[PDB]
Design a protein around this ligand. Structure first.
Ligand SMILES: CCC(=O)N(c1ccccc1)C1CCN(CCc2ccccc2)CC1
Ligand SMILES: CCC(=O)N(c1ccccc1)C1CCN(CCc2ccccc2)CC1
Ligand SMILES: [Cl-]
Ligand SMILES: [K+]
Ligand SMILES: [K+]
Length: 185
């Protein structure tokens, strides 16, 4: 199932020059950013999708991350499977680990309020995280078997909503700079 969605969002801070490439490819060059997310993916996420990507350029600085990102509604939940990043001190509620796709991931949950979401500029939502314990090598084909994460989260009481919104292999950042180029299928 080929990608059919182009995510390109920023809060307006700094520069986020995002390029909608051929098929599932995209490029990002960013500097002195506020909050942003960019990437190719799917209009409707699925808990059964296996996501393939190749991040041919990955050079983040600060809290810039290479991650599967997506949302559900009912309830409103943002989720993250983080494979690499620049500098990022992960902290919060911690639920265990999951092994997937040759790596081990730390599981976190966080809450946001008065915060931007796909529902508006000042909303409340929960965030589910799988954060790889070591940064994943980039430049070769990589898989994220997302059902492994959904199921691990489920086993710790982190259930996703029933209405699936976008699901993107993204470059996401906050107060960050860098360069990335990723193909997604
Ligand atoms: C598991 C995810 C995660 O770890 N986080 C997170 C939470 C929500 C949304 C995005 C990322 C961090 C939580 C803690 N903050 C510390 C920031 C800070 C440091 C020093 C003084 C004042 C503030 C940074 C983000
Ligand atoms: C402290 C880290 C941080 O703040 N972030 C982050 C999270 C994970 C990995 C790297 C950076 C941001 C979290 C929020 N998203 C925007 C959410 C959104 C999407 C669509 C419409 C409206 C809002 C951008 C990145
Ligand atoms: Cl995001
Ligand atoms: K294009
Ligand atoms: K751990």
């Amino acid at each position: 199932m080929s990608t059919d969605y182009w995510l390109n969002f920023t809060d307006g801070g700094g520069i986020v020059n995002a390029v909608n490439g051929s098929g599932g490819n995209y490029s990002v060059n960013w500097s002195n950013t506020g909050s942003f997310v960019v990437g190719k993916g799917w209009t409707t996420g699925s808990p059964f999708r296996t996501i393939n990507y190749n991040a041919g350029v990955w050079a983040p600085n600060g809290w810039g991350a290479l991650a599967l990102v997506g949302w559900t509604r009912s309830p409103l939940i943002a989720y993250y499977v983080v494979d690499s990043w620049g500098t990022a001190r992960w902290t919060g509620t911690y639920k265990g680990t999951v092994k997937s796709d040759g790596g081990t991931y730390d599981i976190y949950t966080t809450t946001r309020y008065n915060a931007p979401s796909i529902d508006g500029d000042r909303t409340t939502f929960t965030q589910y995280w799988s954060v790889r314990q070591s940064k994943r090598p980039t430049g070769s084909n990589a898989t994220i078997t997302f059902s492994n994460h959904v199921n691990a989260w489920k086993s710790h009481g982190m259930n996703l909503g029933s209405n699936w919104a976008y699901q993107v292999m993204a470059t996401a950042g906050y107060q960050s700079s860098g360069s990335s180029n990723v193909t997604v299928w």
